Design a protein around this ligand. Structure first.
Ligand SMILES: [Ca+2]
Length: 279
């Protein structure tokens, strides 16, 4: 399949080179996989989701995304126009309030929720979780992310936006999950992206067009936007049979575009997520 005039980040995912605008992908498109978006919620009724999105848990008075961030992330995972895995099922877990913040205890509860709830869903090709959130180091938060990964969910987490070593942030610093840095359309590390030896991969994170609340769309930037590109890519690859949840991060790193990014500090991977699709 070929989607012309795609968002630059989709085109970058399927390209060995910057500067193209068509997204190429296998038509299976993540069908039979599931992605949990652990964030501010998802506006499921948005047509771009085509009935494939639903809210499954909230820790607040409503399951509505009153912020937009979670809807934007879900759109990069799996919206029809803006998504990597255009046929995946999307499950929203609202651990962040409408101001975008959440207590660590609530975030931990939402991760444990996903580890159990996947047993209530039909995801024969595999289960992914996209965690576009983070704060300071917490061994409890890291343990919760490690448990989720151990349960058989591919966990993708944002490195954080502090232009600092991700070792000091959670869940970014948990070794066993897939920690995602952000790049821009000219193959530079995004200026805000955290770095360090705990990173596994980079994805597109600067000026990312996706869905928003109110049936709308907008471009925004962050490692929170890079993370759903990698989560969607994992779902896509798991549907193709190329990898499993336990192996997907290593598979993506093994098949990544290698050595092509700029402003990568010494000691940080220079790997950019790539779908290796050949039509
Ligand atoms: Ca890792």
């Amino acid at each position: 399949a070929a989607q012309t005039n795609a968002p630059w980040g989709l085109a970058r995912i399927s390209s060995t080179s910057p500067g193209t605008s068509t997204y190429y992908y296998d038509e299976s498109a993540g069908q039979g996989s599931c992605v949990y978006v652990i964030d501010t919620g998802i506006e499921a009724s948005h047509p771009e989701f085509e009935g494939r999105a639903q809210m499954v848990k909230t820790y607040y008075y409503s399951s509505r995304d009153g912020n937009g961030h979670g809807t934007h992330c879900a759109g990069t995972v799996g919206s029809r126009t803006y998504g990597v895995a255009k046929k995946t099922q999307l499950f929203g877990v609202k651990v962040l309030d409408d101001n975008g913040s959440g207590q660590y205890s609530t975030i931990i509860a939402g991760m444990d929720f996903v580890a159990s709830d996947k047993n209530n869903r039909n995801c024969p090709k595999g289960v992914v979780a996209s965690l576009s959130l983070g704060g300071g180091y917490s061994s409890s938060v890291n343990s919760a992310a490690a448990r989720l990964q151990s349960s058989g969910v591919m966990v993708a987490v944002a490195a954080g936006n502090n232009n600092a070593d991700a070792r000091n942030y959670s869940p970014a610093s948990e070794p066993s999950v897939c920690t995602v840095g952000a790049s821009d359309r000219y193959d530079r590390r995004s200026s805000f992206s955290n770095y360090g030896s705990v990173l596994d991969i980079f994805g597109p994170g600067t000026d990312i067009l996706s869905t928003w609340i109110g049936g709308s769309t907008r471009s925004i930037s962050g490692t929170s936007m890079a993370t759903p590109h990698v989560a969607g890519l994992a779902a896509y690859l798991m549907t193709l049979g190329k990898t499993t949840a336990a192996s997907a991060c290593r598979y993506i790193a093994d098949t990544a575009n290698k050595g092509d990014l700029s402003n990568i500090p010494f000691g940080t991977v220079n790997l950019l997520a790539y779908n290796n699709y050949q039509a």
